[PDB]
């Protein structure tokens, strides 16, 4: 039997280190055995096959200029301006170290944003400013360790783990893995996969890398890695070592806008073939933004321009009627479909019992409408919506700063005894966790007991406490980037908040109206549409 | 059946796409049309009825059931009772180098494996690894660049 | 199968004693049949593997010299001369630690402290000194014995508790093992995670380590075990037979500046490979000290001083113009951006019903304000943080003694029939066993009823006696290290904590002003902007 | 979404006939007939409103008229998606009358004429529309 032979050959063809040549040669000298029954040569012919294919001693050339890289990230969407620096700032930390310092430092570069934004594009960039290759590698659904570890050599019908079959793709011994999603991994199974992940994402424990197919541990000591992931509270803390935050924030509509001019809708008409014949005037793509998505980045306007850019081929296959064609804002919904959403959310009409705080889900911002029933009753206080008690601690201390302040706003004189309430809080368990929203509730109470009208399209966020302080929060950029997304112009905030502020690079300020304040008298003196 | 009215446009969009192919336009970023519907609306009809209206031979080879990369891949290339997986086979059926294939109930899939088969079906459905497509009970790449596909289901969920 | 040829070496060229050829046999009883789906022999073989790979018959050099353990420690992260005297002490008495030997005493030597100090570190250096080997993992996040005992070994997923697995990880059988957060568990699954711990606890009933994995025992007695906790407020009663309490408090602003100064600099230089490049003047790091950073480790101290390594390898690699950049104090936010803190405490302005105590949080004592808000109502109370209740009694305590206060600061002489109390504590969920905002939180309510203004920095403590008198609490150390470097300089003790007073170096005594007093009603005409 | 229906009940006792308290005093059972429905959450708010008003003032909900929806802690009715299957299930199942949200007259347009030719829709705004149309026997 040949195959032997090409077993044997492929031994010969590729190098490998010292222990993996005698285990190899040994394990090819097991030969001549059983082909059939317990399958002593075919399980064996696919174990030596792994061992020779798998790339030994064969790398990229890689880049030791940052300039270049500022460079090319100044060609994906619009730069950003602001988290390419920080790219740069761990590239040239991996610059410097490379003399023989390498090892036991420099985290992984956890980057954080909501789905779909410049995260694969951005390894992309770097993997196009290297030299390197490039792969991706899904965590979502991991229990096995022998999903990443190697698993059992047993029987034929065996298989190693993802980091295998992901190294024996390329070509050479140093890729770049974007790691997909991995903080969404499961233990329900044998073997809990986060101490597997430490095992591979470490820079002194790579070296050592737990193989069960294989005999000899591979070495993962000069892949570079870059991590996505949504959310740092499912994040744990044995991987919260070795991680520097790269936070990846919400975009801006005028970012998104030439985001679509400069690399969205060149894209897609050059997919569906329509090269130089339909046009866009920016207008209507500022319709398909305002109208027909609501979301964080590039994933809502790729699915839009995307049927624009068939229909507009099968119209165009039924008689070629024009020279170009170009669209206005106006029929875009022949192409699209009825109107979504609001064009601004001014179209909102106040309620009189209902706020809208802002918050932030950790794949994209978002309001809220708190919602509040002051019905006939004892002095309950029931809190729907999956909440603790940090959110049932900040609707009694508004109530009790109502109780301070009875007559300023229009209530009786004693109600907490007579007046149950209920309140519905869609999802206020989300992340940064407790309450950010406590001037919402605030307000909502104040409506919905005073019975006067809240506001829309005038939108919150921040603490409050006892005697009535609004105290700062931390984040205050998410939050604004969620007034920003859900089409918000005019916020309010504690007046502790503004050395935040000047920090705000300035797409994110200029459309938008902060009325800060420092009491909840201030917004229950902007927010109410009588005073009460 | 009747005309539907809704999905045969659709289906006409989709298909003014693949009227603007056929250069050397790269453009294989190509989405393969997931049909979803409840039992029995209709969807082998369309399967048939786009592969006359193309001048194609319609094969069915459904896939409900699976957990293993040996239904579509071979097997032991070493006994009697070595065999391919359900393409080849399928290919040995029909006799055309650019078929219909319609696949059915994709949604059905299991796991009892190391391994799910999705990974296997991702390697003959894109447009680019399907060209070196070897089982192990081959040795050479069969392609399937010029195999048009449409597949069925009946949940997008699972 | 073919792996038997192998396994039967593996029991017999693995040094293996009698009881363990007898568990050997116990599995070997399962073994030898087809490994056609069979997941009891699956998990057989794997604990199979489990015996064989476990080490046997290897002691350490384990040296015995105690200057040499004085002389490792002479670098450990900045001295602190009384705690390293008392392990050097302990090394110096314990001919006992399984040396000249008798049954007395076995203590576990447990720490507690800043959850940043290097007493992790310490524990390093200790192993250095014995030559033995290290390892570590955290009993936080463990409500079960499924981490400590293994899995019921009767069908696949069985799988040891990781104390096997981390001797496995040890090559050697008598190492020094590491806990980490011994204090932070939960009576949820297979009955009390410390039942299991008893089971560890005395170094003759781990010997016998039985599992519902294991069946043969286990040895565990040779290997040194030492916990390290960092809750300063519980000790769980089980363990208290057999222990040796060792404490490390917190620092002093020039204590952590000198820390600064020797060790920390260096070592995030060499993370992003300068060569010392980079000057920091201690006016700059002093300033980093007070602005930025509020803990009593140095892991603010840590990062910070990495981000301004990292941020000047950036600026470096972009040219090459420098011998050196001594960076003084206002071009750190060029580097570092905004600072948090504030070295001005004097913008405090006393406020209506508040107060500012000491508590004695699991990072040490530390200050929080304590906020009431006296509303119209009934004559109740109400507290919120889910405290201990020796806040509740505090309060108790508190209002009694203004109910018998009452004309001579100018209360009404009813206020249990009109108004309810609500009080927050931000963390006095604490077992600190014994208010130590007694006074604190009577100032507060004094201040409330009152409805007089309340000076804030000074900072008060301790415990209020029924009669009228302010009982001492220990732990004075920490919180008069707090509220130093927090800003503050009044400060309202007890009489009867005047020893402690001598317990603290006059560096903390020379920036601070400790007022020595037992009536509280001194201190209400001390804090009130009226004199009563 | 029960509690919900219950909330907006008890802002609304006067109009139903009702006793003046009923919070107090009587405890409810739900049965939900359906084994697991990949639809998830309530496509069926004011089903369950309707269900409990004519349970608690003991007069029967009339079993022609289908509808569906979600509510709100003040009777504000909020949209659902998935229209033409609601529709070809309501009329699969030989049902002539829809009731839908007010927010849903956008969405009652882009539908063949095939599926909106035995159907008679009739489009409220609120939970008082809905107990506008199917409660008739108040006494």
Known sequence: ????????????????????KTKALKELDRLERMQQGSPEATVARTYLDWLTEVPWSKADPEVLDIN????????????????????????????????????????????????????????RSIARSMNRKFHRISLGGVRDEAEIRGHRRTYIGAMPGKLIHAMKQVGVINPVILLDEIDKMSSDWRGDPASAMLEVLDPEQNNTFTDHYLDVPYDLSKVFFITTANTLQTIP???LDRMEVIEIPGYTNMEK??????????????????????????????????????????????????????????????????????????????????PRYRPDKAETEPQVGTAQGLA???????????????????????????????????????????????????????????VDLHVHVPDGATPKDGPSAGITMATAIASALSRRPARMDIAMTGEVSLRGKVMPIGGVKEKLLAAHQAGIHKIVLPKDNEAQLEELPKEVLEGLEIKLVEDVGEVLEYLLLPEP
């Open 360 to 418: 932030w889900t950790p794949v994209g911002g978002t309001l809220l409408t708190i919602e509040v029933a002051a019905v006939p009753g004892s002095g309950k206080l029931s809190l729907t919506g999956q909440l603790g008690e940090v959110m049932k601690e900040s609707a009694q201390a508004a109530l009790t700063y109502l109780r301070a302040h009875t007559q300023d706003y229009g209530l009786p004189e004693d109600f907490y005894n007579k």
């Open 237 to 239: 803390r044995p991987l």
């Open 257 to 338: 806008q030439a985001i679509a001019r400069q690399y969205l809708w060149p894209k897609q008409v050059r997919e569906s073939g329509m090269e130089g014949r339909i046009e866009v005037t920016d207008a209507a793509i500022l319709r398909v933004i305002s109208e027909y998505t609501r979301e964080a980045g590039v994933r809502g306007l790729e699915r839009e321009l995307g049927k624009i850019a068939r229909k507009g081929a099968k119209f165009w296959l039924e008689g070629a009627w024009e020279g170009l064609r170009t669209i206005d804002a106006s029929d875009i919904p022949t192409y699209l479909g009825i």
């Open 68 to 123: 270049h890289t500022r460079q090319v990230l100044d060609e994906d969407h619009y730069g950003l301006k602001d988290v390419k620096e920080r790219i740069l700032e761990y590239l040239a930390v991996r610059q410097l170290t490379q003399g023989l310092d390498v090892r036991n430092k420099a985290p992984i570069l956890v980057l954080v944003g909501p789905p779909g934004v410049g995260k694969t594009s951005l390894g």
């Open 1 to 20: 039997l040949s195959d032997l032979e090409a077993l044997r050959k492929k031994i010969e063809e590729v190098g490998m280190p010292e222990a993996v």
